[PDB]
Design a protein around this ligand. Sequence first.
Ligand SMILES: Cc1ncc(COP(=O)(O)O)c(/C=N/OCCC(=O)O)c1O
Ligand SMILES: Cc1ncc(COP(=O)(O)O)c(/C=N/OCCC(=O)O)c1O
Ligand SMILES: Cc1ncc(COP(=O)(O)O)c(/C=N/OCCC(=O)O)c1O
Ligand SMILES: Cc1ncc(COP(=O)(O)O)c(/C=N/OCCC(=O)O)c1O
Lengths: 276, 276
Amino acid sequence: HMNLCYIDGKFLPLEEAKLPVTDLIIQRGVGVFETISTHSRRPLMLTPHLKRLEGSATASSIVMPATLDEMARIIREGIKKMGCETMVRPYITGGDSFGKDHLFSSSRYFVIFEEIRKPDPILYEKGVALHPINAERYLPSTKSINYMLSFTGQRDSKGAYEILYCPEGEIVEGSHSTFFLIKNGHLITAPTSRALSGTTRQIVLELARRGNIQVEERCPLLTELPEAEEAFITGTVKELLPVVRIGDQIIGNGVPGKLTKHLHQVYLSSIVEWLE
Amino acid sequence: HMNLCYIDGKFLPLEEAKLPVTDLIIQRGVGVFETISTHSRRPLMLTPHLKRLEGSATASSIVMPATLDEMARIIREGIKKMGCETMVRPYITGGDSFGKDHLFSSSRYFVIFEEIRKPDPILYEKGVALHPINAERYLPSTKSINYMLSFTGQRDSKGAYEILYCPEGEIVEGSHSTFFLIKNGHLITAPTSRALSGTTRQIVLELARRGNIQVEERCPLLTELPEAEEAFITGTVKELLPVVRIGDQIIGNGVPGKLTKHLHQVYLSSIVEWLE
Ligand SMILES: Cc1ncc(COP(=O)(O)O)c(/C=N/OCCC(=O)O)c1O
Ligand SMILES: Cc1ncc(COP(=O)(O)O)c(/C=N/OCCC(=O)O)c1O
Ligand SMILES: Cc1ncc(COP(=O)(O)O)c(/C=N/OCCC(=O)O)c1O
Ligand SMILES: Cc1ncc(COP(=O)(O)O)c(/C=N/OCCC(=O)O)c1O
């Protein structure tokens, strides 16, 4: 499929788009981004993602190089050009210098558009296995471009779907996901002091509120997994994806659970509410 | 001289060099690098730096896109072109994909050459102030491109020379430096399990051995700074730089100390031994 990069006023073929090696995104990993998905070629949680992008940029001392309205206009135009369900990634770079004011004031920006790659249907029927590691994301409210740990953590993950950040036995989040445990019919998920404030997470808490499902905002523990009924990971692209194994531990009876399948169905039935 | 970037077979002006936005260095912070300085237009600790670059690349699941001999040849050719004292940074990128083998096997590489920017002479006479933060580099043996913390740590550093990583009151290293405390005429410095295995650090331990100066390889503590005589930070470019203040704490008498000045003099008198 055709893939785009919006950069410097133009929607380029993604393979043509290039960034100056002066940019501190390249030299020193100074960059923040979001991942935005579409349903019916409309962006899911567009405003919440763009507010989170500005939040990341501000927390990283980056001055936004475009307004949120302009980032929204570009995203909409690139989706129109794609003419398919799209995964969209707006990037904000450090640019060429850190000023005497302790800000990155010449930030660059670009927006990647790719045909969306949903997890295979079989993964929703089977559920996935997570690989726990003794590590976590620093400043986890900020979605920087530093995802090195998500790949080096796979060195000994032996083909697990995703890495799970379990610093000192406390489950925080996936490398690309919010993590939820189900224990005695209630949700357990790490607080926003430890894990990224997921857009999908924020919708799942709202669905829990609507369904009178109790939510405990505390880290699930690896040692609680034998008492767990179910588990799932959330994000843009993957939606709610059942977790049936973590390390050598089977979750409940090792197939996707009733409350997971329920929350996924309600999510998909309700999803247009959060489209823009 | 014009600052250069060796990329794709050519020495470009640094500001003209560009990298495809497909590269996972940009998208996901997948990259490792080294910083190499010159004395008499010869690269200092060239082989130790290139072995540390390979070590970073291997620890990050990156297959090296060039041999160490070829990285050496480029470094030497660019220094010859510069015809001045140079700070050199070979970068190894993740490239466009993480393979089914859990390796980045289409890595890109580039080499930046800049006219060297030594600390002002006044900083060696005065000494510098460090700003301690409650944070640390993950996988600190690996020198990845993720230096975001080195900038976000400056948010409330109020103009300190550098950030000092002091997780839970244990001093590990600077954002760009190895850290040394002097107490009762012995050196204290964090072990290589905690801090980057600095080239400058490795020379200073050797100078300590030659001078019969005892070295304790443990993290100095913020709480022991009142009992400290001296402190200094080491690296490529800065050499040995006296530290006379850490947060609100003056180090000894608040001027560069006798053993710091001695180690810096011996380092500069001996430096040709480590040039290549
Ligand atoms: C299946 C899936 N789940 C979750 C995520 C969210 O992960 P982050 O992007 O926040 O790490 C993505 C991201 N795709 O990103 C676009 C496709 C790609 O970057 O390869 C994804 O593809
Ligand atoms: C570290 C992390 N935690 C949690 C999440 C889930 O948050 P939402 O997606 O629900 O807002 C993400 C999103 N990645 O999205 C997929 C990875 C990507 O393509 O960049 C993430 O990167
Ligand atoms: C004064 C000084 N000390 C120490 C370092 C070592 O720090 P790292 O590179 O390992 O973080 C550098 C690096 N210059 O790098 C070249 C100029 C620059 O990147 O701004 C430096 O200029
Ligand atoms: C994080 C960190 N620790 C310690 C050091 C000291 O290592 P050596 O330089 O002695 O091998 C450096 C080097 N920066 O290199 C110069 C500063 C820079 O360009 O970041 C560093 O980046």
